[PDB]
Amino acid sequence: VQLVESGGGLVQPGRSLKLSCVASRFTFSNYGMNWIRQTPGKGLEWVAYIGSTSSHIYYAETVKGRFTISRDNAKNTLYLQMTGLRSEDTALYYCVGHVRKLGAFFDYWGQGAMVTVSSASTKGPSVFPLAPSSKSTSGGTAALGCLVKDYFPEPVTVSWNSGALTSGVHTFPAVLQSSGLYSLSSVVTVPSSSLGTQTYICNVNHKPSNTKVDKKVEPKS
Amino acid sequence: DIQMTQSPASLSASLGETVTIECRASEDIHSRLAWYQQKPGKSPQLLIYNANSLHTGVPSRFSGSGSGTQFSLKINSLQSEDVASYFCLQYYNYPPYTFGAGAKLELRRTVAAPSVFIFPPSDEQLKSGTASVVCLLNNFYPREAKVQWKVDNALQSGNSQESVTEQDSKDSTYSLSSTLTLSKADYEKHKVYACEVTHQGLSSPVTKSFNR
């Protein structure tokens, strides 16, 4: 992307955490940069803004100074460091840009890095292959997938063939099971002729648990 | 401290018709508003600046209307990819930046029958002690769908969990996954596993099964 946001996945309430955001294809030295967080449920909240030479720094009243925002032009990195963390603070953090001599309104947003504070400990995901049944002759279309189970906290990144396969892919929203752990299924539809000829590998990554799995799905014998 | 109120929270319209999203400002902002569109599973992007001027890459369909206290966003002949959540933005008050509550725009497309698939638990998950059988509905409309599990003609309840994806940005269709979680023991206690789907797109409930 242009703004990539590498930061912490899980932390304990009362502890600290430093978020970083890097700019790649634009200059990033004449653009005002800000940090804006959205909690799931589609509630958008602006927490901080910093000027081109860090002369003007603005923070939200909920934060009251608890966060410190700085930026480095040489390394093209925006830093937001959070001293005190609460359960309400758990949210998706967006690295946001401003508009060159037009307005003080925002224009571009990064992918977003979500921080989740919880007393609970991190748990790695278990991946199990969803093999496609033999059916639909040759003119029909079949589907195959991957099952992610028992992971905390959110989120998990699931892709196919390292991003080579992006069409017909459905990554279902994580559902919360009774054990308290998350579980989701990622499926994809492909032509029947492709099976046995084409290799389908789903890559699942869980940043807080440091779990990087490249899992291959072949039809069951 | 300025207050950005946005109503109604959720909206819906057919394909090809227009939509008007209202945004109200507490301090009668002097035409200093921005409209942002957030696609499903994606970061929000700028749609309209100055509350009446279109952004460089966005299509002419989106329009900015209104001033002072009241603003409106107009979408003309919206396509399947227009499914999104829209927010407002004020820059009149520099110290505190505030957004709107957000309008959830859904769409109305013609009926689509789901393609049913059934997935047995892997033999590596049998070493875990738990078995997961997955039912798949891929591209259907509307969201309303009945998925029931059938084992040796037994209606399973309290063990299954459903999950519906967000509306696709290409065909505006929904995807549902019905996950059935059992123990390894009971997984091997029974012979046939079946999934029955009843949907508006189907003339009659489509069942798909396997005998392991």
Numbering used by the authors:
A (entry chain H): 2 to 222
B (entry chain L): 1 to 212
Task: Quote the passages of the study that discuss this structure, keeping the authors' original sentences.
The folding and membrane insertion of OMPs is catalysed by the essential β-barrel assembly machinery (BAM)2–4 which in E. coli comprises five proteins (BamABCDE). The major conserved subunit, BamA, is a 16-stranded Omp85 family member that contains five N-terminal polypeptide transport-associated (POTRA) domains that extend into the periplasm to scaffold four lipoproteins BamB–E5–8, all of which are required for maximally efficient OMP folding. BAM exists in an ensemble of conformations, with one of the most notable differences between published structures occurring around the seam or ‘lateral gate’ involving β-strands 1 (β1) and 16 (β16) in the BamA barrel. The POTRA domains are also dynamic, with motions of POTRA-5 also occurring alongside changes in gate conformation, with POTRA-5 plugging the entrance to the BamA β-barrel lumen in the lateral-open structures, but moving aside when the lateral gate is closed.
